[PDB]
Design a binder for this molecule. Structure first.
Ligand SMILES: C[S@@+](CC[C@H](N)C(=O)[O-])C[C@H]1O[C@@H](n2cnc3c(N)ncnc32)[C@H](O)[C@@H]1O
Ligand SMILES: C[S@@+](CC[C@H](N)C(=O)[O-])C[C@H]1O[C@@H](n2cnc3c(N)ncnc32)[C@H](O)[C@@H]1O
Lengths: 394, 395
């Protein structure tokens, strides 16, 4: 294996606090850091954690093609990889979600035979779900770039969530330091009118970028987006959320094949699990405390853990080593090079803890860290799921 | 305002490392922590950070309805909020992505007048994009729960990415500790055959849950999913990625209205920005170093920052306060209660720094931490970074 590595990481959206613990650890360990971030508090923070940082934003310029900038950013990173160094690239949000140069740099590095990896981060869509109080699972989610959405005539589903990025620069790919003049916005509004109608809601969303700010969560009708003083509020960090227009019915063949009925139970398509989506037009009130909810809450007084439940039963030495593997990239690289040698040098481990670390298998680690009861084995991964349509049928 | 708050946070997918700095700080600051996580190293880590934690997973049981469990989890959290405490709920991944009880608890607390907020985290879909080397923007992304996909007959787009969660428990909502018997998996395989054809690829994806493990990124044809040896590999943490079957063409009217028009250039739908999606069937090789790429690289030697570029120009004292507001929830609460009193007790700030913090305005803070040059008063101002696809392969 060749000297040199490229790891691309994210900052998240909200300054400093939305960075992951592993993103931070890689930035600290790197020989060289290259970054493109949105706010100066995040920039200042990065520079305190590594002595050899370069700002990629300086490679944009007025009238200079963005694709030429991306080629330059990628080549700067890959040049240091070719010299045998551990390089880290840092981008705003999740570094592979609506970003060009990260994918280019990683693919070049990988094809020339160097180690290459992207670490995930928190994206603007992750913030959207949290701030607007929606779940992509209910009733499904479509995500597009706004100019692509129009140019390639991408389909909408009126029964699912729709999220549109880059609504502030329709049809514009030029760079200018004073930013976008969005004079083809009306082409997007026309499309939304044809798909949803003039009175359907559109939510203007801007996630807070500093820890003290509130998010923008402003509902307008499609028609109001034609008003000049509303249209001008949409800029370079604006995203649209468009809620469903209707509820989709269930397919009788699938109901049969999945054996979800004894008779026609009357699970109406409009019947919902609390809470309902508050942006959806003409959505009725859902009762949070039904008779079945009240009865479930009554059982809490008598509750004990079930006999099959596995309590945590670990040690300081074992918790410390699992933490070190997640937060120290050098410790992890040593462990992966030689499981046994590494396991032997960790002090205070019991024989089981040492044996599980030597093997590295998930089940071995679970047994060393959790007490497994007789009743469970006689018949042990969690099995947590989201419930929607099935829980409201039978 | 009523005493008490609820903050729901995530742990991410890979044990410990994928937790956010703010998730950790809220767990440390809470009066009571309630958690549901699926690996013991993450559980042990949480327990080292707060002395009053309760595992919510103990409220599942064999034959007991998952909805009744959800009602119970929600009520344990909100009972403590109603006592005036700062409560933190912790869920695997992103706490609002394919999760029931988080939304219920937050909605109840909000309607009754308490402070309520969800902090985003890293989901399994975030992991998927990073490990499979795809971008949702190119060529768009549809995400569904697998049983909902079948029952409500949700539409596919053959020209965009498709992501399906919960493919290991098609049609089944019961709880059992010994787990899912995935007997209706064939119903999903039939639908994928109808929509994509028997020889189209499906990627079986499992993100690494421990730091030393590799992800599962195994490509199969739809037809191969009918083989029992392959179907048995699909479990409770399995997600499917199905890549596009074809490239979608551009609309002439939109090209004309957006003025990307001059002469009719012949930018083909199959032509792509490097790199191409490696999972897509019959994807052509794309050249990383075209003549224009080489010309751009040659300009690197003569490069200087543009006149309008804004270098960072801040202080240790200002950087420390902005870091503290992000990592210390009590300091943030104090700052929000009264900007001016907080700003006046921070030592070593310059007059401009102190004034910007008194205002709280993002432009004022930016101007205090960056050298904004005279070539740049257009405001009466973020980076202006975008993704480029179709437009960059036209004009
Ligand atoms: C080039 S993309 C960068 C996306 C980033 N990598 C991420 O993880 O979200 C630019 C677009 O992201 C979205 N975006 C960026 N910041 C945002 C914010 N604070 N709130 C809402 N959307 C935002 C907007 O649609 C913007 O046009
Ligand atoms: C109830 S959901 C929870 C999702 C979680 N909140 C998140 O942010 O991704 C369970 C489903 O998430 C997906 N999932 C969970 N862990 C995963 C992993 N390690 N790799 C791939 N998919 C996973 C699977 O589709 C699984 O059936």
């Amino acid at each position: 294996t060749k000297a040199g590595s490229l790891t691309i990481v994210g900052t998240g959206i909200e300054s400093i606090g939305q960075m992951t613990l592993q993103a931070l650890s890689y930035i600290e360990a790197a020989a060289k850091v290259f970054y493109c971030v949105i706010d100066p508090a995040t920039e200042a923070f990065i520079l305190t954690k590594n002595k050899n940082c370069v700002d990629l934003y300086q490679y944009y310029d007025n009238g200079k093609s963005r694709l030429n900038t991306f080629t330059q950013m990628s080549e700067l990173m890959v040049r240091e990889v070719r010299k045998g160094l551990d390089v880290v690239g840092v981008f705003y949000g999740h570094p592979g979600v609506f970003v060009n140069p990260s994918h280019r740099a990683l693919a070049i590095a990988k094809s020339e035979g160097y180690r290459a990896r992207m670490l995930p981060g928190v994206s603007a869509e992750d913030c959207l779900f949290a701030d607007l109080c929606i779940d992509p699972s209910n009733p499904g989610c479509l995500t597009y770039e706004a100019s692509d959405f129009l140019i390639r005539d991408r389909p909408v589903s009126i029964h699912s969530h729709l999220v549109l990025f880059q609504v502030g620069c329709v049809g514009i790919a030029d760079f200018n330091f004073t930013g976008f003049d969005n004079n083809k916005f009306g082409v997007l509004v026309d499309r939304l009118e044809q798909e949803y109608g003039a009175e359907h809601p559109v939510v203007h969303y801007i996630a807070a970028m500093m820890p003290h700010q509130d998010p923008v969560t402003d509902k307008y009708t499609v028609a109001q987006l034609r008003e000049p003083e509303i249209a001008k509020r949409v800029g370079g960090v604006s995203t649209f959320y468009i809620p469903p227009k209707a509820r989709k019915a269930s397919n009788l063949d699938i109901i049969r094949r999945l054996e979800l009925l004894p008779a026609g139970q009357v699970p109406d398509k409009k019947a919902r699990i609390y809470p309902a989506n508050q942006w959806e037009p003409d959505v009725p009130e859902v009762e949070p405390y039904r008779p079945s909810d009240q009865a479930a809450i009554a059982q809490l007084a008598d509750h004990a853990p079930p006999e099959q439940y596995q309590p945590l039963a670990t040690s300081k030495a074992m918790s410390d080593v699992m933490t070190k593997l997640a937060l120290d990239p050098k410790a992890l690289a040593d462990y992966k090079a030689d499981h046994r040698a590494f396991a032997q040098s960790v002090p205070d481990l019991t024989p089981q803890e040492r044996a599980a670390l030597e093997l590295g298998d998930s089940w071995a680690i679970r047994c060393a860290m959790k007490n497994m009861p007789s009743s469970l084995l006689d018949a042990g991964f969690p099995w947590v799921i989201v419930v929607g349509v099935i829980g409201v049928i039978g």
